[PDB]
Amino acid sequence: AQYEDGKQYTTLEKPVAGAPQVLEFFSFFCPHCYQFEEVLHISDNVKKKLPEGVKMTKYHVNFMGGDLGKDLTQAWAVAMALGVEDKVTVPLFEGVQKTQTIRSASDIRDVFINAGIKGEEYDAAWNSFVVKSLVAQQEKAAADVQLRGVPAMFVNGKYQLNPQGMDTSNMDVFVQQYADTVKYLSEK
Numbered sequence: 001a002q003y004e005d006g007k008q009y010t011t012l013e014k015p016v017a018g019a020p021q022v023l024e025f026f027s028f029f030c031p032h033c034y035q036f037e038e039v040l041h042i043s044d045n046v047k048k049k050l051p052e053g054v055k056m057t058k059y060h061v062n063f064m065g066g067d068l069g070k071d072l073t074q075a076w077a078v079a080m081a082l083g084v085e086d087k088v089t090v091p092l093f094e095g096v097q098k099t100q101t102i103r104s105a106s107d108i109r110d111v112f113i114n115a116g117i118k119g120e121e122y123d124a125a126w127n128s129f130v131v132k133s134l135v136a137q138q139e140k141a142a143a144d145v146q147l148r149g150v151p152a153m154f155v156n157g158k159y160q161l162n163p164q165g166m167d168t169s170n171m172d173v174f175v176q177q178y179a180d181t182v183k184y185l186s187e188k
């Protein structure tokens with residue numbers, strides 16, 4: 001076959017019921033996740049190849065960066081609750097990995113302030129129980145698949161993308177093969 005279990009993707013032998021259709025996991029500490037966002041635009045390219053209006057979800061993970069890693073999971077929960085993911089993704093990646101100006105929860109907050117989120121708006125969300133539940137949701141989804149590596153994408157809680165079996169000599173071909181594989185897996 002052209003797509004084979006163990007090549008472009010792997011199959012969870014403990015499938016996850018009720019999981020989002022397309023679920024991505026990342027960390028602002030994760031170097032390939034940086035490339036996935038700024039260089040390859042994996043998420044948008046996958047969306048362009050999926051049918052109209054299918055749900056794509058993207059969650060942060062705790063297991064990179066220790067204490068700040070957990071702060072970033074809470075900040076991503078804030079970003080999801082306010083709907084400002086498109087405004088803070090790039091400055092958070094660059095603040096952590098390029099300029100290395102993100103060293104504390106206060107530095108994370110500064111990114112939101114600079115992006116136009118009001119201070120009282122950010123603090124109220126940060127301490128809200130809705131965000132507490134969003135943090136729990138992100139942790140549970142990662143736990144459901146015993147996730148230990150990022151970037152990761154799962155399709156229908158059953159298939160895990162395997163980018164290690166994709167040619168990386170051409171970045172555009174890589175993204176296309178990745179997106180086409182997600183489309184193929186979604187149609188199973």
Ligand SMILES: O=C(O)Cc1coc2cc(Nc3ccccc3)ccc12
Nearest residue numbers: 032035151163164168169170171174
């Ligand atoms: O090797 C791995 O663990 C799999 C993997 C995960 O995310 C990646 C991102 C890239 N980025 C890239 C850079 C230049 C050309 C093509 C791709 C490459 C491999 C991976």
